[PDB]
Nucleic acid binder design. Structure first.
Lengths: 191, 52, 136
RNA sequence: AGAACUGGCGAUGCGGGAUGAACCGAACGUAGAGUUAAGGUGCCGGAAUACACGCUCAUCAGACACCACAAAAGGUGUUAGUUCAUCUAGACAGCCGGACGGUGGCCAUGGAAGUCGGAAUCCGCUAAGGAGUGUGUAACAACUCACCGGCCGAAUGAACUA
RNA sequence: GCAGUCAAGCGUUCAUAGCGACAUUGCUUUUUGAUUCUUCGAUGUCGGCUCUUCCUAUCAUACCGAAGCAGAAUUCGGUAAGCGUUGGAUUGUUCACCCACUAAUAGGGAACGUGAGCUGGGUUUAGACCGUCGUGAGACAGGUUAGUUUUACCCUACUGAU
């Protein structure tokens, strides 16, 4: 039916700055700069004033509106990413075999090294995606915690480490050994 | 030795799922249709069996 | 090769096509054995399964005490009589084929192994070292 | 394989159906000029990538008869409707709590009063909240749960028909 | 032959792990038939040896998901044909049941692939025996033995050479 035109509202706290030219979206904040290209998705941005910036689609269909919405949620997740920050608390899970996680510099590319997984003789390794520093939590035994900027950084690298721990052709409902993303936090202690 | 704080969370990533009858596709719990385009998006489901 | 035999057997020439009659090396009472099929050989169109030194080959019995006849049994060939080559360059070969009745795991239905024995089939079945005669 | 009323083909060309005797239009002396049928109007082909309103994206699209394949069943894929329902005295979500009590009406009686249960149901305080649902343990004290509903501020849910 | 739809039941409890009747919609040509449209001025007709290629409704392997999957072994399914699918006794055998090795010993065609490639055991002529039928001449998927299998120097396709 082509709903004529709709809009959504993006809102900016004091110390963060969006910059949108063409459809390229720059963000600058306390957590540094983020950049993203939305040009595939075809939307129009309206800036009234700073804290109020409205996105709109005219003469589009169901799917196209459905795209406008997730454009909102995207860019806004970047903004609240550059104020708060993104932190994932993952806790180790092991039964008879404790899992070793080293951080290793190899050609300066930051590889996470996993050893003694299921007592296996294989070495496991994952590249760390860009921007996310990794900590090991204090006074929580067997925890690893990820810290970074955009949701795709932290989320993607985290989940990748999650799925490096799959068990091969054993029972998946009996052996529970692995590493699991549990709590999804924001870097700043308060929020 | 596992303990629920280390265990019951794993059910959410293993043992809490739904499965399509035709394509055996793993699905989140409340999903009302299989996503796969090969199976025909059929709604039929079964809860993934718990231990014993 | 096969399941139950430890050790890495280096390859040797193929001296015993199916039907070949080895002579028995011990108390079994069979004047001679008869091959049928071989453990571990490959399949190729109109190719008889090869047999050779150190092989574990199935066998039947054409001579001697009855209780040996009319039942398939594992057996091992300890003398090839076809010249093969160790990696060290020699070509050594015996003057007749030979074989020993044995269990799947390397134990001997026999006692002592008459005549000389090629060591490639000795050290490959570490059990047979103690039941062995003159080796090499 | 066998018949009936026509028409064709054999005994018949031409244009169209890419091609094919029986399909469509048309029945030819030879030339000229003109206008049309069927079919087409991206390019191969001459002719409008002309106009209009729409609908569909398919990690095995569809493409126009005879002509050369497809079904039964499914799909909040999508679009359009029908009938029920529900409604800014405030919906549906998703958070924040609470659900009081007469009386454990009455009954299994060893005790569960809503709930190892029942042949089966009225009253009091609420702009609310049930002799009444799991945690609970033979029971009991706590809330789960329609709801006052604070936040939320609007239509949504179900069945289908296509 | 294969593939679905629904589901009473079996499956400990339990339609749906796996089964799957009751019915029920399809696909395939690989059998066997029906038709006989084309060839009796002859397309040489079974199987085996040989030799590539192709389709998957994949037997094994790569990668996974379910399981009435603890591990092991095994079952059901998906992306896939890339490679691999045997050695022997008896049979003219297609087929088959057999012993063993096996990662596994899947299914099929390509004019029942390929006779100027072979063999020609079979079937199909002429000889011969027996059983039954026939009064006789004779007849029989009967059962058995014996039985000339031609030419390439043509074009093309290919493999090599200028």
């Amino acid at each position: 039916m082509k709903y004529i035109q709709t809009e959504q509202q993006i809102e900016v706290p004091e110390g963060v700055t969006v910059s949108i030219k063409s459809r390229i979206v720059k963000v600058v904040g306390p957590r540094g700069t983020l950049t993203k290209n939305l040009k595939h998705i075809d939307v129009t941005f309206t800036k009234v004033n700073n804290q109020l910036i409205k996105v709109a689609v005219h003469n589009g269909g169901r799917k196209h509106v459905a795209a406008l919405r997730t454009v909102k949620s995207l860019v806004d997740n970047m903004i609240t990413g550059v104020t708060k920050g993104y932190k994932y608390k993952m806790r180790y899970v092991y039964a008879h075999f404790p899992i070793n996680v080293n951080i290793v510099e190899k050609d300066g590319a930051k590889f996470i090294e996993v050893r003694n997984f299921l007592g296996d003789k294989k070495i496991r390794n994952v590249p760390v995606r860009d921007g996310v520093t990794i900590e090991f939590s204090t006074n929580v035994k067997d925890e690893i915690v990820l810290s970074g900027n955009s949701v795709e950084d932290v989320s993607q690298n985290a989940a990748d480490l999650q799925q490096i721990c799959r068990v091969r052709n054993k029972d998946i409902r009996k052996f529970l050994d692995g590493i699991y993303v549990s709590h999804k936090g924001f870097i700043t202690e308060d929020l | 030795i596992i303990e629920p704080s280390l265990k019951a969370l794993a059910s959410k990533y293993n043992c809490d799922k739904s499965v399509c009858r035709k394509c055996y596709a793993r699905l989140p719990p409340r999903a009302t249709n299989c996503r796969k385009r090969k199976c025909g998006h059929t709604n039929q489901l079964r809860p993934k069996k718990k231990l014993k | 090769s096969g399941n139950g035999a430890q050790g890495t057997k280096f390859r040797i020439s193929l001296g015993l096509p199916v039907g070949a009659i080895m002579n028995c090396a011990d108390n079994s009472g069979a004047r001679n054995l008869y091959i049928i099929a071989v453990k571990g050989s490959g399949s190729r169109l109109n190719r008889l399964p090869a047999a050779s030194l150190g092989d574990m080959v199935m066998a039947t019995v054409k001579k001697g005490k009855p209780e040996l006849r009319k039942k398939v049994m594992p057996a091992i060939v300890v003398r090839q009589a076809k010249s093969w080559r160790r990696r060290d360059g020699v070509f050594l070969y015996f003057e007749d084929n030979a074989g020993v009745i044995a269990n799947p795991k390397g134990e001997m239905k026999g006692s002592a192994i008459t005549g000389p024995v090629g060591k490639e089939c000795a050290d490959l079945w570490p059990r047979v070292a103690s039941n062995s005669g003159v080796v090499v």
